[PDB]
A paper describes a structure:
Contrary to most organisms in which three enzymes compose the 2-oxoglutarate dehydrogenase complex (ODH), actinobacteria rely on a two-in-one protein (OdhA) in which both the oxidative decarboxylation and succinyl transferase steps are carried out by the same polypeptide. Here we describe high-resolution cryo-EM and crystallographic snapshots of representative enzymes from Mycobacterium smegmatis and Corynebacterium glutamicum, showing that OdhA is an 800-kDa homohexamer that assembles into a three-blade propeller shape. The obligate trimeric and dimeric states of the acyltransferase and dehydrogenase domains, respectively, are critical for maintaining the overall assembly, where both domains interact via subtle readjustments of their interfaces. Schematic illustration of the reaction steps involved in the oxidative decarboxylation of 2-oxoglutarate with generation of succinyl-CoA and NADH/H+ (ODH reaction), with emphasis on the catalytic steps catalyzed by OdhA. These include the ThDP-dependent decarboxylation of the 2-oxoglutarate substrate followed the reductive acylation of the lipoyl group provided by E2p (both catalyzed by the OdhA E1o domain), and the transfer of the succinyl moiety to the CoASH acceptor (catalyzed by the OdhA E2o domain).
We therefore decided to produce in E. coli the full-length proteins KGD from M. smegmatis and OdhA from C. glutamicum for further studies. MsKGD presents an homohexameric assembly, which can be described as a three-blade, triangular propeller shape, approximately 20 nm wide and 15 nm thick. The E1o dimers containing the Mg-ThDP compose the blades, with two central E2o trimers sitting respectively on either side of the blades plane. This oligomeric arrangement as a trimer of dimers allows the separate E1o and E2o domains to maintain their canonical oligomeric arrangements (i.e. E1o dimers and E2o trimers) as seen in other oxoacid dehydrogenases, with their functional catalytic centers at the respective oligomeric interfaces. a Domain boundaries in MsKGD (Nt: N-terminal helical domain) and (b) cartoon overview of the MsKGD hexamer in complex with GarA (gray). Zoomed views highlighting the position of the N-terminal helical hairpin (blue) are shown below. Crystal structure determined at 4.6 Å resolution.
Residue numbers in the entry:
A (entry chain B): 228 to 562, 567 to 814, 831 to 1227
B (entry chain H): 52 to 147
C (entry chain A): 603 to 727
D (entry chain A): 853 to 1227
E (entry chain A): 353 to 477
The structure:
């Protein structure tokens, strides 16, 4: 057909040479053009035979009957093929068989199989089948069923692989083959009572198959049948099944302008710098305008901000063509190993910008968030940031106008979606009472590889995105070569997210152009895959030819686009070449405490309180008006004062509403009705009726660790002016979220600068309830502490914890405070605090005994010095009171990091007759505070801590001993060692 | 003041005055243009504000995202007082 | 340990170790998969934990496959004091299993005859 | 008819030359340690993220045909003795998913289900191990103790200070040492290919089920200095403590030493080349290959050599609050006070992240420690 | 059952409704089953029109009529009251079945036979 169209194009424009006419060995004429049924042509010399193709039409007799009559019987059009031959060589048998052979081809299946292969058609061609003699009623149920089968597994027989690696998925399905459902090409023109298929109650079979093709078999795979909500399935059919309008030439031109800047950006990055073989968005440039479509739709939808969390791949391209940052602020201080790394830190940093609608009438905010090299680790952090901004706007969940104007645009790697486990925890928190974001747009960029690990070995599912079906998320597997399709899929996802407030997943099937290393030819591992990519064309240049070929654009429009490509390529190369040459009161009055103490008994009219909780409310009324305030009430007084001041408090953790150890009771539930009551929300309204502006957010987190910690961290980033607190059930379970601590909390304020104002309450206490119910592993927090990055603290008195929270909530300085709340010491009658502690005092980083500070205590009498931190102080003080050992002093180090150098040097100068120093901790030797203190103290304060002894438990691989009897012996061993 | 004043309404540099008082005033995503309207949508060469006596015809010169005068794609148009001339994402207003 | 669902990948590693030892299942001439992992789970721990997904991804890999696993979730409709509404964003806790096309049989824990049939049918599958 | 990839082809011929002459790089030494175990009759299960080809194009345990796409394993050929008899050993090499928690939990469960198996898990970079921190804290370290589930797993963690970012440099050794109890694990940091070869063979044939946490290098794989002769693989054993080559085999004066350097990683090669440039015969460098348990006897005997030593230093590329110093600086003057009392530390400044983001900063900081230990 | 006066539609018109209702009971049989032993949400049984027969243009009069149910309980023809009794005991009893979301066809066919059959009552032993 290429040689036919050359001879046709040249004959039409009079450019045929005489060397074309000389050589006709066999000719063909078409008298059937003028309706002449058949002809007996005259055969010229030099030709062996000449073929006279007749008129392809219905015979003369049928010309008068209705079409509905003809197709219902099974009569078809025909061509009267003649073959006038030369008898001097060709005989009747050969010419008769030659025409028979032609007939066999024109009705063959392999003939059309070969033609469809050459024309780039992946679908099964029509086969010559003789009419099914079944009635229309019998055929109807087959056609109804075939329609349902196409919706359930239409995505499997879809042309969504741009590399066309598996050619068998288009033929390995009898549930989608029409011939299998008792149907033939004769039934194609018959009407079937398809109840609400394309809206129409009656449709011709050829229309029914073409609708299903353009809806579920084209470049968009639709998987929506698994969704449990019915209106959502009805909704997707109203969009997918409609014969979609071809986009305008102006819309197509904006797609090509967005693809010109994306292909030129990666052209510049793979030229200007080296080592950029990794992070090369070549092949997936289509994801740049895909995100643009999401954000253009969002602005049209009346939304405020789109927060993007994405991995290292093509991140600089997004920063310039999507966020809206100039090339100048991108390559300011930019930086050849065989292994991949981080390169310039811009690949981690998150900058903000603004998006102006090209065709619409609105402008929307586009911000990017910081993430480490750990794939999908940012997922819960982004959903926490989006929720922080929504709550701030009096919109979404915590607001009068539940719009959810902040939209999370989360991008992911192909193998990283099915691979990582965080992916599931994040989906679980996408629709919770105090965690929902009202839907999230997920764009997985399936490059069909992961370094050298085959996608087959990286997932146990057909699609990578099959994890999303946990929450009924519709999946649209779209081809990354068709940009017009990618935009439609992206814009449709926005409509779904705005209509149902549910996460949507777009699988962009593309190809990775080059390996992750500069000297990496991954054709060692996948030779067949990279053999195809070798012969592939750029997703911008290929789309350019398609618009010319389809008659959408002209050669003048091809010059407008080609000049724009060079105009944007020169734009960044010259801008970079030019820019290179130029190179506090922490206490409240007692009347505030009495307001919080009365809020526990300010129950609504007819609120039947549970009898086990009922006396706790009355006890807190007594504590706020007299004293002996336990840790449980002190915790609520610290936050209760901050809410009444006007600050937002977000306390949420595993069973934190009631309290892990029945101590918080921030939410009390009616025994008869089941209504919830929050006493801390009463403080958000001043006595004069005026709202303070503060708010109390208390929720119960799922059985998650990684995402529970990552969400609260993201909240303190999205809203710094918020007291964000996360309480674990037991400190020991924090190792699940170790990536959030190591990569986001400790090194957050430093690697990038994302200031963390999060408080991590970790129940720590040596009681012997097992290794997983005792030590919250302090040794690790101290091990990753740098000068001014975190604030590790271990309070001993309820008053000190009160000042600690108030100090961290009103310091202004964004620094993560890791508090270690006690477990048994909550109900300890000794661990109480008077009113004068909460009113006439400040936070104490170092704490002396009560006899030396307030009572009549002799500091000279002290010879033996004890240094401690946890509840162990109360056991050492009672042991001292039993033996009247006036030679032993106990000092507490409340702030473990930074070490209170000045507060401790001044305090150590008191008690001058001290001749021995000890660090008494319940934790083992290799664990606790000794591994850091025993090496820091004689190096920082050698005038006192030189020759420091250690009175602690033996070193174990687990935080504590399994048997409860063993713990009692070991706890008494340390008490006798420090008192002998 | 005797000549046309284009004031950008939508764009990064919104609320800016420019004067078309020459037989040829150049606009585009390149510094070799009098009105350097910078953005990824805008092409290197976009449109000209030619002045013929007492007439201002804003003419397109091979741009990908065309030139829309009052949301209408044109190749040559005699711009009148108060028109939405669009170059990529930018939208300016004519004044006489 | 006390960490819920933490032993999930450890059990599937133990079952695979014994399958390879017996010259059956994935590594050997036979393909019996004679070692069957009976994994029991907490109601909020199936949807709430992330390891659950990583573990299901391993259930059918070239050198990780165990040839199927019987999972018996004990949905007691509670987790200490957290309601299942605040513990999962799906109708069932077991909706996580849908990742690999795992058939889910929501049976009543009061009818014993039904529980036995459901359990025995799972073995057949 | 196996058409090998031309990029892989010379690496096959180089390993034929290395086994018959010497200068065996870390990459071939790794396969020789397991290749001998398979031929002996032991099961080897090496699987990790992109471990089949090798994270840094070094393993090549499986090579794929360029024309056909067939897989070829050279270590499985050793499972059959020359006389046709099968040895009983097997090589299991797979590419794990983008999983951390389950990838580590699966290999651990394999060493419990089959103790008589060399189970090895290789991370892409050591820094990504924090995802599976629950498997390390609850099953590996406290497994052999809380319940008694004996772990015979080997965790290869690519560790090397090159400056490719905080998530592509330090595998956080400080934490492994922090949770180490008397005889629960075996943390190790090899410096020579021969030592790593004996380390794996020793752990694979000791009988004692103990998790060996090996820290494989990244750049030092292709380092021309980090090689080993045949004499090391044949006429030698595992060395928990390692002296310089001039004092042990060459003509080296032990008395000339006044300045004593203690190190562990690839940093030794930079300190030895700096010493060779300035001919500083007063500086000796001893390596602590087995970090835990500390080789008390092997080090006391070695510390008695070089008697004119008047100063001791611990030189590590890792920051001050990270690396080995937080444990060593408090253990060494308490266990061996006759030598390590008054030990000085030559290392990087304390950071909250394992390394600095910019590559230029790493070059300055790495040179600062080299000039501090040589002045 | 509710007193509803006969649907004047033909059997052909009623057939496609009955075919669709069978698939609707297969997709969400679990959503209206008695699998909650505490019977906390009594509305789950009534909050589903895709399973309500009256919604699919059917009455108690159509209960004794034959419908061309393509391979429902093996039989190509069945009375409506028989069709709704198989679906009740198979899905809405104490075993909710989520087998329609699986992509392998023979697996769906397999569960269909083991679920849509009047299963024998277990022996007294
Ligand atoms: C948590 C984590 N573990 C390991 C790595 C090392 N790594 C870098 S690229 C890669 C595979 C790429 O997978 P995918 O997410 O599909 O990225 P893409 O191939 O699309 O670039 C891996 C394992 C990582 N970056 N993050
Ligand atoms: C990983 C982990 N985090 C926290 C806890 C603390 N905890 C003890 S009981 C409980 C809730 C129980 O939930 P579930 O898994 O539904 O238990 P079930 O009663 O169904 O067995 C929690 C959070 C735990 N045991 N494991
Ligand atoms: Ca603050
Ligand atoms: Ca062994
Ligand atoms: Mg990928
Ligand atoms: Mg429970």
């Amino acid at each position: 057909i290429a040689a036919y169209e050359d001879i046709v194009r040249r004959a039409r424009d009079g450019k045929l040479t005489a060397e074309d006419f000389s050589g006709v060995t066999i000719s063909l004429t078409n008298p059937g053009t003028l309706g002449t049924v058949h002809s007996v042509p005259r055969l010229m010399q030099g030709q062996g035979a000449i073929i006279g193709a007749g008129a392809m039409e219905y015979p003369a007799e049928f010309q008068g009957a209705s079409e509905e009559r003809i197709a219902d019987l099974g009569i078809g059009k025909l061509i009267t093929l003649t073959s006038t031959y030369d008898h001097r060589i060709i005989q009747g048998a050969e010419s008769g068989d030659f025409l028979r052979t032609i007939h066999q081809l024109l009705l063959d299946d392999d003939f059309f199989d070969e033609i469809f292969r050459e024309l780039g058609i992946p679908y099964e061609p029509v086969r010559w089948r003789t009419d099914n003699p079944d009635s229309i009623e019998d055929k109807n149920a087959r056609v109804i069923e075939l329609i349902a089968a196409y919706r359930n597994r239409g995505h499997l027989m879809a042309d969504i692989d741009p590399l066309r690696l598996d050619n068998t998925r288009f033929r390995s399905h009898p549930d989608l083959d029409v011939n299998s459902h008792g149907l033939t090409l004769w039934d194609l023109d018959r009407e079937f009572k398809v109840d609400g298929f394309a809206g129409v109650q009656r449709k011709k079979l050829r229309d029914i198959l073409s609708v299903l093709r353009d809806a579920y078999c084209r470049h968009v795979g639709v998987e929506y049948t698994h969704i449990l909500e019915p209106e959502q399935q009805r909704w997707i059919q109203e969009r997918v099944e409609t014969k979609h309008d071809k986009p305008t030439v102006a819309e197509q031109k904006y797609i090509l302008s967005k693809l010109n800047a994306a292909e030129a950006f990666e052209t510049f990055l793979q030229t200007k710098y080296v080592g950029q073989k990794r992070f090369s968005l070549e092949g997936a440039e289509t994801v740049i305008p895909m995100m643009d479509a999401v954000i253009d739709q969002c602005a049209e939808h009346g939304l405020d901000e789109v927060v993007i969390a994405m991995p290292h791949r093509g991140r600089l391209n997004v920063l310039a063509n999507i966020v809206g940052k100039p090339y100048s602020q991108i390559f300011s201080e930019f930086e050849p190993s065989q292994a991949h790394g981080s390169g310039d830190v811009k690949y981690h940093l998150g900058a903000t910008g603004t998006y102006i609608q090209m065709f619409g009438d609105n402008d929307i905010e586009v911000s990017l968030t910081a993430n480490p090299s750990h794939l999908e680790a940012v997922d819960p952090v982004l959903e926490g940031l989006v929720r922080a901004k929504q709550d701030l706007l009096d919109t979404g969940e915590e607001g009068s106008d539940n719009r959810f104007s902040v939209v999370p645009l989360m991008l992911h790697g192909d193998a990283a979606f099915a691979g990582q486990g965080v992916v599931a925890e994040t989906l679980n928190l996408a629709l919770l009472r105090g965690y929902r974001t009202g839907g999230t747009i997920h764009i997985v960029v399936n490059n069909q590889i992961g370094f050298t690990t085959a996608p087959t070995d990286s997932r146990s599912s057909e699609y990578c995105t099959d994890v999303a079906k946990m929450i009924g998320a519709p999946i649209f597997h779209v081809n990354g070569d068709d940009p017009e399709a990618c935009a439609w899929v992206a814009r449709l996802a926005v409509d779904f997210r705005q209509a149902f407030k549910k996460d949507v997943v777009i699988d962009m099937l593309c190809y990775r152009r080059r390996g992750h290393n500069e000297g990496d030819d991954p054709s060692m591992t996948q030779p067949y895959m990279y053999d195809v990519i070798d012969t592939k064309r750029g997703s911008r240049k290929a789309y350019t030819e398609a618009l010319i070929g389809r008659g959408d654009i002209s050669m003048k429009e091809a010059e407008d686009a080609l000049r724009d490509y060079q105009g944007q390529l020169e734009r960044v190369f010259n801008e970079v070449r030019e820019l290179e040459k130029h190179e506090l009161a922490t206490a409240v009055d007692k009347a505030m405490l009495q307001r919080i103490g009365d809020a526990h008994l300010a129950l609504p009219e007819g609120f039947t309180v549970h009898p086990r909780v009922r006396p706790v409310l009355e006890k807190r009324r007594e504590m706020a008006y007299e004293g002996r305030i336990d840790w449980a009430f002190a915790e609520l007084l610290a936050l209760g004062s901050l809410i009444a001041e006007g600050k937002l408090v977000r306390l949420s953790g595993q069973d934190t509403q009631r309290g892990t150890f029945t101590q918080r009771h921030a939410v009390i539930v009616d025994r008869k009705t089941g209504e919830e009551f929050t006493p801390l929300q009463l403080l958000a309204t001043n006595p004069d009726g005026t709202p303070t502006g503060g708010k109390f957010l208390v929720y119960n987190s799922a059985l998650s660790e990684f995402a529970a910690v990552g969400f609260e961290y993201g909240y303190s980033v999205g809203n710094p002016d918020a007291m964000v607190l996360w309480e674990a059930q037991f400190g020991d379970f924090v190792n699940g979220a170790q990536s959030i601590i190591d990569e986001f909390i400790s090194s957050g304020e430093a690697k990038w600068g994302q200031l963390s104002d999060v408080v991590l309450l970790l129940p720590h206490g040596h009681e012997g309830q097992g290794p997983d119910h005792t030590s919250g592993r302090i040794e690790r927090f101290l091990q990753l502490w740098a000068e001014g990055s975190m604030t590790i603290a271990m309070p001993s008195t309820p008053a000190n914890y009160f000042h600690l929270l108030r100090r961290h909530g009103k310091d202004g300085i964004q620094r993560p405070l890791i508090v270690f709340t006690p477990k048994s010491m909550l109900r300890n009658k000794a661990a109480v605090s008077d009113i004068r502690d909460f009113t006439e005092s400040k936070f104490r980083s170092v704490l002396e005994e009560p006899m030396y500070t307030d009572g009549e205590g002799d500091r000279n009498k002290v010879t033996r010095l004890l240094l401690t931190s946890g509840k162990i102080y109360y056991e050492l003080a009672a042991r001292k009171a039993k033996e009247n050992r006036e030679d032993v002093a106990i000092v507490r180090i409340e702030q473990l990091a930074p070490l209170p150098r000045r507060r401790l040097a001044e305090t150590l100068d008191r008690y001058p007759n001290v001749k021995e120093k000890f660090w008494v901790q319940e934790e083992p030797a290799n664990q606790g505070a000794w591994p850091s203190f025993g090496l820091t103290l004689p190096e920082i304060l050698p005038d006192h801590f030189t020759g420091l002894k250690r009175i602690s438990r033996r070193a174990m691989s687990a935080p504590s001993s399994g048997s409860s009897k063993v713990h009692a012996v070991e706890q008494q061993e340390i008490l006798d060692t420090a008192f002998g | 003041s005797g000549s046309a004043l284009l004031v950008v309404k939508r764009g990064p540099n919104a609320g800016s005055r420019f004067l078309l008082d020459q037989p040829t005033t150049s606009a585009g995503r390149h510094p070799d243009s009098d009105i350097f309207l910078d953005d990824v949508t805008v092409s290197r060469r976009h449109a000209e504000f030619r002045l013929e006596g007492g007439e201002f015809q804003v003419v397109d010169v091979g741009s990908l995202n065309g030139t829309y005068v009052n949301r209408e794609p044109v190749d040559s148009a005699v711009l009148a007082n108060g028109d939405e001339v669009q170059i990529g994402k930018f939208r300016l207003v004519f004044l006489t």
